[PDB]
Amino acid sequence: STGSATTTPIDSLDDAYITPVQIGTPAQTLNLDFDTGSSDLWVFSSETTASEVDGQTIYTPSKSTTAKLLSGATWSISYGDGSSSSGDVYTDTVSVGGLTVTGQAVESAKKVSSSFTEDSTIDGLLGLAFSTLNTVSPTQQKTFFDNAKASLDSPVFTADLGYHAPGTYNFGFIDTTAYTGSITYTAVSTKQGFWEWTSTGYAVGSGTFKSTSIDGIADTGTTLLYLPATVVSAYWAQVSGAKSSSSVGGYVFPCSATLPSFTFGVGSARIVIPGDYIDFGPISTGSSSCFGGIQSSAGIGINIFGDVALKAAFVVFNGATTPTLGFASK
């Protein structure tokens, strides 16, 4: 089997992408944030505290003839950005782009943190990291991909995120028309539960490529590119007037600037992020200070190849017995 679904930016900055997901019978379609940096499929629901729902579409398990309470199971997650959610668990039928999994754990939120409530466009998350990170207790649950894997034509999914435009998540096949050149594959460590890999270096604009190992994770659920402070300083030094602002929370730059590209290495291959992808617009409405899309990871503990990086590539998440990642230009 295969599946193919379009993923759409939630706003004009590409802050996140939403993909429609059918849950239950009859289907309830919710728009979920596919997140290769986490491993829970959780949704706003009829159980979510009413004051914490503000415009999201909810899953109502009592209206699904295939829903079953997973008795005793609870979940609670905290994300790298400080947001969180928790609740109980149902199993139900879940379909993405025509690919159906029966008995998928659907984690129903009883509580969500304010950042989720305040984002009316995201009805939940669909985690695509390794199932070892799933938070369901006392019986850890598998991700949608883990459950689908055996049925898929090939045990892979691909992320093809758009710049200011829709893109595609495919399951079970690699669309050879969706990229240019060849796909370069690179080793993955699953020791932390992430799609963790080592980039071979970087370049700023037309500058020389610096060969250096940068361990990080491929994370579709993170907006920006978070890299070591040395790398980030080298990038922003090429933008007149750019500076790190402690009050804003990262590097800002004059909105009148033209940003240089940023290249990262995948083996001997190179992925070029155009400068425009690194512009996240005014820090507040009407400001002439703009927020940068490349930021320091120094306070995170891990480097994160988020959407800024991934949207410059066609990315293969190869879930074979020994997982690997593939990157192609497009």
mmCIF file of C-alpha atoms in Angstrom:
data_model
loop_
_atom_site.group_PDB
_atom_site.id
_atom_site.type_symbol
_atom_site.label_atom_id
_atom_site.label_comp_id
_atom_site.label_asym_id
_atom_site.label_seq_id
_atom_site.Cartn_x
_atom_site.Cartn_y
_atom_site.Cartn_z
ATOM 1 C CA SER A 1 0.000 0.000 0.000
ATOM 2 C CA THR A 2 0.866 3.670 -0.252
ATOM 3 C CA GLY A 3 -0.510 7.013 0.852
ATOM 4 C CA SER A 4 -0.055 10.563 -0.398
ATOM 5 C CA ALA A 5 -1.360 13.717 1.284
ATOM 6 C CA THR A 6 -0.864 17.401 0.673
ATOM 7 C CA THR A 7 0.542 19.450 3.539
ATOM 8 C CA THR A 8 -0.288 23.162 3.692
ATOM 9 C CA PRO A 9 1.397 26.035 5.572
ATOM 10 C CA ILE A 10 -0.748 27.363 8.399
ATOM 11 C CA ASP A 11 0.214 31.002 7.736
ATOM 12 C CA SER A 12 2.205 33.270 5.437
ATOM 13 C CA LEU A 13 5.485 32.519 7.261
ATOM 14 C CA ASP A 14 5.371 28.709 6.997
ATOM 15 C CA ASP A 15 5.337 28.513 10.800
ATOM 16 C CA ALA A 16 3.986 24.965 10.536
ATOM 17 C CA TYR A 17 2.235 22.701 8.053
ATOM 18 C CA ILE A 18 -1.082 20.891 8.417
ATOM 19 C CA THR A 19 -2.112 17.667 6.724
ATOM 20 C CA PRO A 20 -5.670 16.307 6.721
ATOM 21 C CA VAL A 21 -6.130 13.024 8.573
ATOM 22 C CA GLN A 22 -9.265 10.867 8.659
ATOM 23 C CA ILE A 23 -10.035 9.417 12.092
ATOM 24 C CA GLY A 24 -12.873 7.063 12.920
ATOM 25 C CA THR A 25 -16.004 5.793 11.233
ATOM 26 C CA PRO A 26 -17.571 7.761 9.673
ATOM 27 C CA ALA A 27 -14.395 9.726 9.099
ATOM 28 C CA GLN A 28 -13.696 12.801 11.178
ATOM 29 C CA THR A 29 -11.119 14.857 9.293
ATOM 30 C CA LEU A 30 -8.670 16.772 11.478
ATOM 31 C CA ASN A 31 -5.736 18.861 10.274
ATOM 32 C CA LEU A 32 -2.658 17.563 12.049
ATOM 33 C CA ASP A 33 0.935 18.800 12.327
ATOM 34 C CA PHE A 34 3.124 15.916 11.128
ATOM 35 C CA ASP A 35 6.116 15.951 13.450
ATOM 36 C CA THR A 36 9.216 13.842 12.770
ATOM 37 C CA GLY A 37 10.536 15.023 16.150
ATOM 38 C CA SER A 38 7.878 13.329 18.307
ATOM 39 C CA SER A 39 5.993 10.062 18.474
ATOM 40 C CA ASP A 40 2.453 10.738 19.727
ATOM 41 C CA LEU A 41 -0.649 11.107 17.582
ATOM 42 C CA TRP A 42 -2.812 13.371 19.723
ATOM 43 C CA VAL A 43 -5.902 15.397 18.934
ATOM 44 C CA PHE A 44 -8.187 18.048 20.266
ATOM 45 C CA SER A 45 -11.295 16.158 21.267
ATOM 46 C CA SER A 46 -14.708 16.214 22.886
ATOM 47 C CA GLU A 47 -12.772 15.581 26.115
ATOM 48 C CA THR A 48 -10.588 18.697 25.864
ATOM 49 C CA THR A 49 -11.286 21.275 28.575
ATOM 50 C CA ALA A 50 -13.751 23.618 26.889
ATOM 51 C CA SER A 51 -11.869 26.817 27.777
ATOM 52 C CA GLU A 52 -8.791 25.369 26.036
ATOM 53 C CA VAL A 53 -10.532 24.884 22.668
ATOM 54 C CA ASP A 54 -10.675 27.956 20.415
ATOM 55 C CA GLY A 55 -11.629 27.108 16.839
ATOM 56 C CA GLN A 56 -9.972 23.699 16.434
ATOM 57 C CA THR A 57 -11.841 20.785 14.940
ATOM 58 C CA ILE A 58 -12.296 18.092 17.567
ATOM 59 C CA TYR A 59 -12.352 14.303 17.485
ATOM 60 C CA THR A 60 -15.447 12.887 19.192
ATOM 61 C CA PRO A 61 -14.815 9.174 19.850
ATOM 62 C CA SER A 62 -18.430 8.546 20.877
ATOM 63 C CA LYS A 63 -19.441 9.334 17.275
ATOM 64 C CA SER A 64 -17.003 6.782 15.804
ATOM 65 C CA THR A 65 -18.272 3.210 15.568
ATOM 66 C CA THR A 66 -14.676 1.932 15.451
ATOM 67 C CA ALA A 67 -13.360 3.858 18.469
ATOM 68 C CA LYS A 68 -12.449 1.872 21.584
ATOM 69 C CA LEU A 69 -11.133 3.261 24.847
ATOM 70 C CA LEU A 70 -7.639 1.923 25.539
ATOM 71 C CA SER A 71 -8.448 1.175 29.131
ATOM 72 C CA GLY A 72 -6.087 2.642 31.704
ATOM 73 C CA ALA A 73 -3.858 4.364 29.163
ATOM 74 C CA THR A 74 -2.830 7.979 29.661
ATOM 75 C CA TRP A 75 -0.357 10.251 27.940
ATOM 76 C CA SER A 76 1.464 13.476 28.707
ATOM 77 C CA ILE A 77 3.983 15.236 26.507
ATOM 78 C CA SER A 78 6.158 18.318 26.745
ATOM 79 C CA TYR A 79 7.745 19.707 23.606
ATOM 80 C CA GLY A 80 11.047 21.493 23.125
ATOM 81 C CA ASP A 81 9.256 24.845 22.841
ATOM 82 C CA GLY A 82 7.713 24.516 26.310
ATOM 83 C CA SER A 83 4.232 23.546 25.125
ATOM 84 C CA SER A 84 2.462 20.470 26.442
ATOM 85 C CA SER A 85 -0.683 18.357 26.345
ATOM 86 C CA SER A 86 -2.117 15.284 28.080
ATOM 87 C CA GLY A 87 -5.127 12.992 28.193
ATOM 88 C CA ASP A 88 -6.394 9.468 27.626
ATOM 89 C CA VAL A 89 -6.276 7.127 24.646
ATOM 90 C CA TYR A 90 -8.575 5.470 22.142
ATOM 91 C CA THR A 91 -7.791 3.102 19.341
ATOM 92 C CA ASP A 92 -9.473 3.878 16.040
ATOM 93 C CA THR A 93 -9.022 3.699 12.298
ATOM 94 C CA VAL A 94 -6.730 6.416 10.953
ATOM 95 C CA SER A 95 -6.154 7.187 7.281
ATOM 96 C CA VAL A 96 -3.629 9.544 5.680
ATOM 97 C CA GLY A 97 -3.787 10.200 1.970
ATOM 98 C CA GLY A 98 -5.529 6.899 1.281
ATOM 99 C CA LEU A 99 -3.335 4.765 3.579
ATOM 100 C CA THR A 100 -5.361 3.214 6.397
ATOM 101 C CA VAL A 101 -4.207 1.846 9.755
ATOM 102 C CA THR A 102 -6.656 0.050 12.003
ATOM 103 C CA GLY A 103 -6.166 0.057 15.752
ATOM 104 C CA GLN A 104 -4.057 3.221 15.793
ATOM 105 C CA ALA A 105 -3.638 4.830 19.201
ATOM 106 C CA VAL A 106 -5.390 8.201 19.035
ATOM 107 C CA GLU A 107 -4.413 10.217 22.093
ATOM 108 C CA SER A 108 -7.346 12.396 23.127
ATOM 109 C CA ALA A 109 -6.359 15.632 24.836
ATOM 110 C CA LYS A 110 -7.985 16.507 28.104
ATOM 111 C CA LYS A 111 -5.585 19.438 28.591
ATOM 112 C CA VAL A 112 -3.475 21.450 26.160
ATOM 113 C CA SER A 113 -1.133 24.340 26.867
ATOM 114 C CA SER A 114 -1.975 27.868 25.792
ATOM 115 C CA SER A 115 0.102 27.847 22.602
ATOM 116 C CA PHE A 116 -2.053 25.027 21.246
ATOM 117 C CA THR A 117 -5.312 26.729 22.231
ATOM 118 C CA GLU A 118 -4.130 29.945 20.589
ATOM 119 C CA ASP A 119 -3.425 28.227 17.250
ATOM 120 C CA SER A 120 -6.822 27.500 15.746
ATOM 121 C CA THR A 121 -5.320 25.923 12.614
ATOM 122 C CA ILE A 122 -3.705 22.871 14.255
ATOM 123 C CA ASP A 123 -6.082 20.157 15.488
ATOM 124 C CA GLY A 124 -3.319 17.945 16.896
ATOM 125 C CA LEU A 125 -0.017 16.308 16.069
ATOM 126 C CA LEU A 126 0.931 13.136 14.233
ATOM 127 C CA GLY A 127 4.325 11.982 15.449
ATOM 128 C CA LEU A 128 6.753 10.361 13.024
ATOM 129 C CA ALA A 129 9.849 9.891 15.202
ATOM 130 C CA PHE A 130 10.641 6.463 16.624
ATOM 131 C CA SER A 131 8.027 4.748 18.759
ATOM 132 C CA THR A 132 10.453 4.548 21.693
ATOM 133 C CA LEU A 133 9.512 8.219 22.351
ATOM 134 C CA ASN A 134 5.766 7.590 22.567
ATOM 135 C CA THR A 135 4.453 8.800 25.930
ATOM 136 C CA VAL A 136 1.468 6.461 26.437
ATOM 137 C CA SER A 137 1.573 4.722 29.810
ATOM 138 C CA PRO A 138 1.565 1.978 30.975
ATOM 139 C CA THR A 139 1.737 0.434 27.498
ATOM 140 C CA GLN A 140 3.735 2.452 24.977
ATOM 141 C CA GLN A 141 2.033 2.779 21.598
ATOM 142 C CA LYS A 142 3.304 2.725 18.027
ATOM 143 C CA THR A 143 3.312 5.637 15.601
ATOM 144 C CA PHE A 144 1.128 5.686 12.503
ATOM 145 C CA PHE A 145 4.206 4.934 10.379
ATOM 146 C CA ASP A 146 5.294 2.050 12.599
ATOM 147 C CA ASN A 147 1.806 0.535 12.348
ATOM 148 C CA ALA A 148 1.630 1.046 8.568
ATOM 149 C CA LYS A 149 5.192 -0.034 7.804
ATOM 150 C CA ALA A 150 4.600 -3.732 7.154
ATOM 151 C CA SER A 151 1.776 -3.002 4.693
ATOM 152 C CA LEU A 152 3.666 -0.349 2.739
ATOM 153 C CA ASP A 153 5.259 -1.123 -0.607
ATOM 154 C CA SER A 154 8.544 0.162 0.851
ATOM 155 C CA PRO A 155 9.119 1.054 4.531
ATOM 156 C CA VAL A 156 9.619 4.769 3.901
ATOM 157 C CA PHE A 157 7.906 8.101 4.056
ATOM 158 C CA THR A 158 8.948 11.328 2.375
ATOM 159 C CA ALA A 159 8.589 14.989 3.295
ATOM 160 C CA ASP A 160 8.409 17.541 0.491
ATOM 161 C CA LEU A 161 7.589 20.796 2.257
ATOM 162 C CA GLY A 162 6.834 23.903 0.229
ATOM 163 C CA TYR A 163 8.206 27.409 0.577
ATOM 164 C CA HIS A 164 5.143 29.621 0.960
ATOM 165 C CA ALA A 165 3.206 26.857 -0.783
ATOM 166 C CA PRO A 166 1.712 23.411 -0.188
ATOM 167 C CA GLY A 167 3.850 20.298 -0.300
ATOM 168 C CA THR A 168 3.439 16.544 0.094
ATOM 169 C CA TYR A 169 3.899 13.701 2.568
ATOM 170 C CA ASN A 170 4.112 10.325 0.840
ATOM 171 C CA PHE A 171 4.062 6.912 2.522
ATOM 172 C CA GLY A 172 5.428 3.723 1.006
ATOM 173 C CA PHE A 173 7.060 5.064 -2.158
ATOM 174 C CA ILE A 174 9.594 7.580 -3.427
ATOM 175 C CA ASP A 175 8.189 9.911 -6.117
ATOM 176 C CA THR A 176 11.122 10.148 -8.513
ATOM 177 C CA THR A 177 9.482 13.138 -10.247
ATOM 178 C CA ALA A 178 9.554 15.234 -7.071
ATOM 179 C CA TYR A 179 13.272 16.020 -6.907
ATOM 180 C CA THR A 180 16.224 16.836 -9.136
ATOM 181 C CA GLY A 181 19.498 14.960 -9.357
ATOM 182 C CA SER A 182 20.047 12.067 -6.983
ATOM 183 C CA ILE A 183 19.102 11.365 -3.378
ATOM 184 C CA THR A 184 22.065 11.196 -1.008
ATOM 185 C CA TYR A 185 21.487 8.868 1.928
ATOM 186 C CA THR A 186 23.169 9.278 5.288
ATOM 187 C CA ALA A 187 23.289 7.232 8.478
ATOM 188 C CA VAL A 188 20.757 7.661 11.291
ATOM 189 C CA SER A 189 21.177 7.084 15.011
ATOM 190 C CA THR A 190 17.973 6.121 16.799
ATOM 191 C CA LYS A 191 19.607 6.216 20.245
ATOM 192 C CA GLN A 192 17.608 9.303 21.298
ATOM 193 C CA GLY A 193 14.446 8.303 19.429
ATOM 194 C CA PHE A 194 14.931 10.903 16.678
ATOM 195 C CA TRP A 195 15.913 10.902 13.020
ATOM 196 C CA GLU A 196 19.389 11.939 14.119
ATOM 197 C CA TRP A 197 22.136 12.327 11.525
ATOM 198 C CA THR A 198 25.435 14.141 10.956
ATOM 199 C CA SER A 199 25.723 16.902 8.384
ATOM 200 C CA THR A 200 29.156 17.218 6.804
ATOM 201 C CA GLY A 201 29.415 21.016 7.009
ATOM 202 C CA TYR A 202 28.084 24.327 5.806
ATOM 203 C CA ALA A 203 28.617 27.406 3.681
ATOM 204 C CA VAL A 204 27.290 30.946 4.013
ATOM 205 C CA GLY A 205 26.215 32.541 0.749
ATOM 206 C CA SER A 206 28.879 32.166 -1.916
ATOM 207 C CA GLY A 207 31.544 31.483 0.711
ATOM 208 C CA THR A 208 33.747 28.438 0.946
ATOM 209 C CA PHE A 209 32.314 25.236 2.355
ATOM 210 C CA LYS A 210 33.459 24.453 5.899
ATOM 211 C CA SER A 211 33.849 20.713 6.440
ATOM 212 C CA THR A 212 32.718 19.953 9.987
ATOM 213 C CA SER A 213 30.448 17.349 11.537
ATOM 214 C CA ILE A 214 27.123 18.737 12.785
ATOM 215 C CA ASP A 215 24.950 16.165 14.574
ATOM 216 C CA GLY A 216 21.278 17.064 14.539
ATOM 217 C CA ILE A 217 17.738 15.859 14.005
ATOM 218 C CA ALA A 218 15.426 16.127 11.011
ATOM 219 C CA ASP A 219 12.345 17.672 12.625
ATOM 220 C CA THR A 220 9.324 18.663 10.548
ATOM 221 C CA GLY A 221 7.598 19.921 13.699
ATOM 222 C CA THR A 222 10.191 22.652 14.333
ATOM 223 C CA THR A 223 9.906 25.828 12.261
ATOM 224 C CA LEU A 224 13.511 27.044 12.244
ATOM 225 C CA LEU A 225 17.049 25.781 11.761
ATOM 226 C CA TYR A 226 18.933 25.559 15.068
ATOM 227 C CA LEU A 227 22.705 25.139 14.788
ATOM 228 C CA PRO A 228 25.808 25.672 16.930
ATOM 229 C CA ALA A 229 26.509 29.247 17.957
ATOM 230 C CA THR A 230 29.720 29.358 15.889
ATOM 231 C CA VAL A 231 27.839 28.470 12.692
ATOM 232 C CA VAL A 232 24.962 30.846 13.395
ATOM 233 C CA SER A 233 27.319 33.733 14.189
ATOM 234 C CA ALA A 234 29.162 33.125 10.913
ATOM 235 C CA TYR A 235 25.871 33.317 9.013
ATOM 236 C CA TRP A 236 24.536 36.498 10.616
ATOM 237 C CA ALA A 237 27.917 38.237 10.368
ATOM 238 C CA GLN A 238 27.186 38.430 6.620
ATOM 239 C CA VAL A 239 24.012 40.482 7.200
ATOM 240 C CA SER A 240 24.644 44.158 7.940
ATOM 241 C CA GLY A 241 22.936 45.174 11.157
ATOM 242 C CA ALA A 242 22.022 41.654 12.267
ATOM 243 C CA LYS A 243 22.458 40.959 15.966
ATOM 244 C CA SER A 244 21.381 38.571 18.671
ATOM 245 C CA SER A 245 18.715 40.176 20.839
ATOM 246 C CA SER A 246 18.228 38.702 24.293
ATOM 247 C CA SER A 247 14.928 40.580 24.622
ATOM 248 C CA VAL A 248 13.497 39.200 21.388
ATOM 249 C CA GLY A 249 14.991 35.738 21.887
ATOM 250 C CA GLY A 250 17.412 35.314 19.012
ATOM 251 C CA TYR A 251 18.986 36.858 15.964
ATOM 252 C CA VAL A 252 17.140 39.717 14.325
ATOM 253 C CA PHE A 253 18.053 41.638 11.209
ATOM 254 C CA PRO A 254 16.939 44.793 9.389
ATOM 255 C CA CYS A 255 13.903 44.073 7.273
ATOM 256 C CA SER A 256 15.627 46.025 4.467
ATOM 257 C CA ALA A 257 18.405 43.415 4.243
ATOM 258 C CA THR A 258 18.821 40.829 1.511
ATOM 259 C CA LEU A 259 19.743 37.540 3.199
ATOM 260 C CA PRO A 260 22.458 35.201 1.912
ATOM 261 C CA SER A 261 21.770 31.556 1.280
ATOM 262 C CA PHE A 262 22.909 28.833 3.676
ATOM 263 C CA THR A 263 24.246 25.497 2.432
ATOM 264 C CA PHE A 264 24.420 22.319 4.493
ATOM 265 C CA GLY A 265 26.260 19.122 3.628
ATOM 266 C CA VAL A 266 24.736 15.665 3.287
ATOM 267 C CA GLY A 267 27.695 13.412 2.634
ATOM 268 C CA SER A 268 29.380 14.873 -0.426
ATOM 269 C CA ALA A 269 26.112 16.508 -1.522
ATOM 270 C CA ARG A 270 24.953 20.023 -0.738
ATOM 271 C CA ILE A 271 21.493 21.415 0.023
ATOM 272 C CA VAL A 272 21.096 25.163 -0.535
ATOM 273 C CA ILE A 273 18.598 27.097 1.571
ATOM 274 C CA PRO A 274 17.799 30.339 -0.317
ATOM 275 C CA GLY A 275 18.136 33.521 1.706
ATOM 276 C CA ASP A 276 14.421 34.265 1.435
ATOM 277 C CA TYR A 277 13.652 31.045 3.350
ATOM 278 C CA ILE A 278 15.519 32.519 6.337
ATOM 279 C CA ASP A 279 13.268 35.613 6.643
ATOM 280 C CA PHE A 280 10.561 35.207 9.305
ATOM 281 C CA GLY A 281 9.301 38.751 9.035
ATOM 282 C CA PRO A 282 8.795 41.595 11.488
ATOM 283 C CA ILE A 283 9.185 40.729 15.158
ATOM 284 C CA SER A 284 5.895 42.570 15.776
ATOM 285 C CA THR A 285 3.461 44.112 13.333
ATOM 286 C CA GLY A 286 4.970 47.158 11.675
ATOM 287 C CA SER A 287 8.480 46.640 13.031
ATOM 288 C CA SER A 288 11.499 47.063 10.785
ATOM 289 C CA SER A 289 13.332 44.397 12.805
ATOM 290 C CA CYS A 290 12.857 40.951 11.285
ATOM 291 C CA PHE A 291 13.296 37.559 12.938
ATOM 292 C CA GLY A 292 15.937 35.199 11.590
ATOM 293 C CA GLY A 293 15.256 31.642 10.477
ATOM 294 C CA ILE A 294 18.664 30.345 11.571
ATOM 295 C CA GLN A 295 19.116 30.447 15.347
ATOM 296 C CA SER A 296 21.528 29.082 17.922
ATOM 297 C CA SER A 297 20.905 25.642 19.421
ATOM 298 C CA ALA A 298 23.143 26.450 22.391
ATOM 299 C CA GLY A 299 20.203 26.508 24.817
ATOM 300 C CA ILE A 300 18.465 23.421 23.377
ATOM 301 C CA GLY A 301 20.999 20.617 23.772
ATOM 302 C CA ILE A 302 20.581 19.381 20.196
ATOM 303 C CA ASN A 303 20.872 20.826 16.712
ATOM 304 C CA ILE A 304 17.593 20.829 14.801
ATOM 305 C CA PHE A 305 17.160 20.743 11.036
ATOM 306 C CA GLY A 306 13.644 22.137 11.112
ATOM 307 C CA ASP A 307 11.369 23.287 8.341
ATOM 308 C CA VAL A 308 13.728 26.071 7.153
ATOM 309 C CA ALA A 309 16.227 23.381 6.170
ATOM 310 C CA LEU A 310 13.878 20.557 5.224
ATOM 311 C CA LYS A 311 11.738 22.647 2.855
ATOM 312 C CA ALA A 312 14.831 23.198 0.698
ATOM 313 C CA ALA A 313 14.988 19.433 0.057
ATOM 314 C CA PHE A 314 13.090 16.301 -0.802
ATOM 315 C CA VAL A 315 13.639 14.222 2.318
ATOM 316 C CA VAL A 316 13.378 10.440 2.596
ATOM 317 C CA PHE A 317 12.751 8.922 6.026
ATOM 318 C CA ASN A 318 13.835 5.331 5.414
ATOM 319 C CA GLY A 319 12.433 3.099 8.146
ATOM 320 C CA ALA A 320 14.142 -0.095 7.083
ATOM 321 C CA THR A 321 15.663 -2.296 9.782
ATOM 322 C CA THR A 322 18.663 0.038 9.755
ATOM 323 C CA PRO A 323 17.070 3.466 9.215
ATOM 324 C CA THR A 324 18.659 6.119 7.023
ATOM 325 C CA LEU A 325 17.794 9.611 5.795
ATOM 326 C CA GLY A 326 17.933 10.759 2.188
ATOM 327 C CA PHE A 327 18.166 14.311 0.880
ATOM 328 C CA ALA A 328 17.752 15.568 -2.684
ATOM 329 C CA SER A 329 17.557 19.032 -4.153
ATOM 330 C CA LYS A 330 14.288 19.948 -5.847
#
